[PDB]
Design a protein around this ligand. Sequence first.
Ligand SMILES: CC(=O)N[C@@H]1[C@@H](O)[C@H](O[C@@H]2O[C@H](CO)[C@@H](O[C@@H]3O[C@H](CO)[C@@H](O)[C@H](O)[C@H]3NC(C)=O)[C@H](O)[C@H]2NC(C)=O)[C@@H](CO)O[C@H]1O
Ligand SMILES: CC(=O)N[C@@H]1[C@@H](O)[C@H](O[C@@H]2O[C@H](CO)[C@@H](O[C@@H]3O[C@H](CO)[C@@H](O)[C@H](O)[C@H]3NC(C)=O)[C@H](O)[C@H]2NC(C)=O)[C@@H](CO)O[C@H]1O
Ligand code: CL
Ligand code: ZN
Ligand code: ZN
Ligand code: ZN
Ligand code: ZN
Ligand code: ZN
Ligand code: ZN
Lengths: 165, 165
Amino acid sequence: GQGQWIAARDLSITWVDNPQYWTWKTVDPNIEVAELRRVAWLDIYGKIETKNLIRKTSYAVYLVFKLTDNPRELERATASLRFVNEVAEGAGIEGTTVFISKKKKLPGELGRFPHLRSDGWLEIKLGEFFNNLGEDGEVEMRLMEINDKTWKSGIIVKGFDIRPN
Amino acid sequence: GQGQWIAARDLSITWVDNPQYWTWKTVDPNIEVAELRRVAWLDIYGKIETKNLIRKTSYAVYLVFKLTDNPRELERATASLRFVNEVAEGAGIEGTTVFISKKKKLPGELGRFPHLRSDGWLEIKLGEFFNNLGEDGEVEMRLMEINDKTWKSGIIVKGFDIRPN
Ligand SMILES: CC(=O)N[C@@H]1[C@@H](O)[C@H](O[C@@H]2O[C@H](CO)[C@@H](O[C@@H]3O[C@H](CO)[C@@H](O)[C@H](O)[C@H]3NC(C)=O)[C@H](O)[C@H]2NC(C)=O)[C@@H](CO)O[C@H]1O
Ligand SMILES: CC(=O)N[C@@H]1[C@@H](O)[C@H](O[C@@H]2O[C@H](CO)[C@@H](O[C@@H]3O[C@H](CO)[C@@H](O)[C@H](O)[C@H]3NC(C)=O)[C@H](O)[C@H]2NC(C)=O)[C@@H](CO)O[C@H]1O
Ligand SMILES: [Cl-]
Ligand SMILES: [Zn+2]
Ligand SMILES: [Zn+2]
Ligand SMILES: [Zn+2]
Ligand SMILES: [Zn+2]
Ligand SMILES: [Zn+2]
Ligand SMILES: [Zn+2]
C-alpha cells in the first residue's frame, strides 16, 4: 500500500540458515517463510530507513507469523522498536513483553495479543513511530526470546509489515 | 482536545508532599511547580484517557522541567510510556534510558536528550503513541530513577505536555 513489506528472507534471524534449527519452506502463494524447529536464542530483527517513507506519517510495524500445532516456550516474548539514534550508550534492547502463543483467556486480560489477518496469518504489533521529515535516521525492531534455558519452537515467520496508521 | 496538559499537582510524584524531599513553589505566570530537594526514589507518573484526544493523530508526551544550578545524580533516568491495557501480567515498567542533566557534548552522541522550549523550560520526550479512534483506553507515562544508593536532586517539575507530533 503506502507502506513497506520486509519478507522473512530479508530479515536478520539468528541461526536461520542452519537447518538443525530453522527450515526454509515455500508456501502459497509462492512465498519463502522460515519455520523454527528449535532455538534457545530467538531473535527476529529488521531495520528500515525513514528517509524512504512518507513524511508527516505515523507507522506501525507488525511481525506476520503462524504457529505450528505445538508451539513451545513462546507464550510470551520481547518486542522492541526504536530509533537507532535514540539508544543511550550502554543501554540494552529495553523492549516490552507481548504474548505470542498464549490465547486471550477472559475479556479483561491485559497485554498485547496477536490476531488474524486477511491472509490467514497472525500478526503482532512490534511498535509504532512517527516519521516527521525523514531525518531522524533508522528504526530497528525485533521480536526476541533470549532465555538460554529454554528451547523455543513452532513459530513460522513470514516477514515484517510496515503500515501507516 | 488537541493534546493535553497535566499540571504538577495532578501527577503522581512519590514523596512530593514531604517538605524534606520536595519543595512546592510558585513561579511566573502564577504556576505551582515541584522542586526536588532530595530523594532516593524518584518517580513522576501521569495518565490520560485517549478518548479526549483528537483522533487519527500521533501524540508525543514530554516531561516539562528545569534544572537547578547543581543537579545531582540525574545524568540519566528511565522513561516509560504505554497503553495501560497492553501491560502483560507480571511485566515490569519496561522503559527506556533517557538523559536529563547530561549535556549532549557530541553532535553524533546517541540518545534522547532534553530540548529547550520556546518558553525557557526544558522538555524530555517520555514516549509516543498513535491515537486511532480513542477506543484503546488510557495511556500511562513516567520518568523515574529508583537507584536506592543515590540521592537525586535539582529537577523542577512543571508538568506533562501531551502534544501531536
Ligand atoms: C542453559 C544453557 O546454557 N542452555 C544452552 C543454550 O545457552 C544454547 O543456546 C545458545 O546460547 C548462546 C548464549 O548462551 C547463544 O549465543 C548468542 O548468540 C547470539 C546470536 O548469534 C549472539 O548475538 C549473542 O551474543 C550470543 N550470546 C553470547 C553470550 O555470546 C546461542 O545463539 C544459542 N544457540 C542457539 C542455537 O540458540 C543451546 C544451544 O547451544 O544449548 C542450551 O543447552
Ligand atoms: C539504605 C540505602 O542504601 N539507601 C536508602 C534509600 O533506600 C532510602 O530511600 C528509600 O528506599 C526505599 C527502598 O528503595 C523506598 O521504598 C520504596 O518506595 C516505593 C514508593 O513508595 C514503594 O513502591 C516500594 O514498595 C518501597 N520499597 C520498600 C522496600 O519499602 C523509599 O521510597 C525510599 N525513600 C525515599 C525518601 O527516597 C533513603 C531514605 O529512607 O535512605 C537511604 O539511605
Ligand atoms: Cl550497521
Ligand atoms: Zn493487526
Ligand atoms: Zn483514566
Ligand atoms: Zn552516578
Ligand atoms: Zn500499568
Ligand atoms: Zn523547540
Ligand atoms: Zn485499537
